């Protein structure tokens, strides 16, 4: 799975910047639990500069649910970046997993930090909207480079229990620990 992402600087703050229409929307449909048409899921948009990877995530989710004490097992999304691309079965120090819940509260996965973690979570009618900004930790990005990437969307229902589980590249639920589940994501122009 190929994706872009145009170069640019959002302001995160859950609102939707007129630049985020200049790059492609990507939709979250590697099914790992629940079904598209009963589960969560988003249609997101990248962007990227010299410092950081800038991901709007746009949920649809009817019930929002945190009670589980998992945080993958709360209503939240799941950012994946593979920084060189090396699609390995297991994470190196460029890895790393971020998450971010419907309350913008963020937990970290092997490689996430809240040192290169920047949120922005705005409730909308049936779902959320998820922006963010992820720093970079090994690399300067310039134009044509390919990082490996993926992005998750928890559901839980009203008892706390998750139903569904849907990524962009992902229909396994390994992204937690295999980045060679993550699909490739070219930065452009
Ligand atoms: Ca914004
Ligand atoms: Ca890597
Ligand atoms: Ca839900």
Do not use: C
């Not at 589960?39 to 709007?56: F, I, Q, S």
């Amino acid at each position: 799975m190929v994706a872009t992402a145009k170069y640019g600087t959002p302001v995160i703050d859950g609102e939707i910047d007129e630049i985020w229409n200049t790059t492609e929307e990507i939709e979250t449909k590697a099914v790992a639990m629940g079904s598209l048409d009963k589960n969560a899921t988003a249609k997101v948009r990248v962007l990227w500069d010299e410092n950081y990877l800038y991901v709007l995530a746009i949920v649809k989710d009817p019930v929002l649910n945190k009670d589980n004490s998992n945080p993958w097992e709360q209503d939240s999304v799941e950012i994946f970046i593979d920084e060189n691309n090396h699609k390995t079965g297991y994470y190196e120090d460029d890895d790393a997993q971020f998450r971010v819940n419907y309350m913008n509260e963020q937990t970290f996965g092997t490689g996430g930090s809240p040192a290169r973690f920047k949120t922005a979570v705005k409730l909308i009618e049936g779902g959320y909207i998820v922006e963010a900004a992820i720093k970079w930790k090994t690399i300067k990005p310039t134009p044509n480079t390919v990082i490996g990437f993926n992005i998750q969307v928890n559901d839980a229902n009203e008892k706390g229990q998750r139903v569904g589980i849907i990524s962009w590249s992902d229909p396994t639920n390994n992204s937690w620990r295999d980045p060679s589940k993550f699909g490739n994501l070219r930065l452009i122009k």
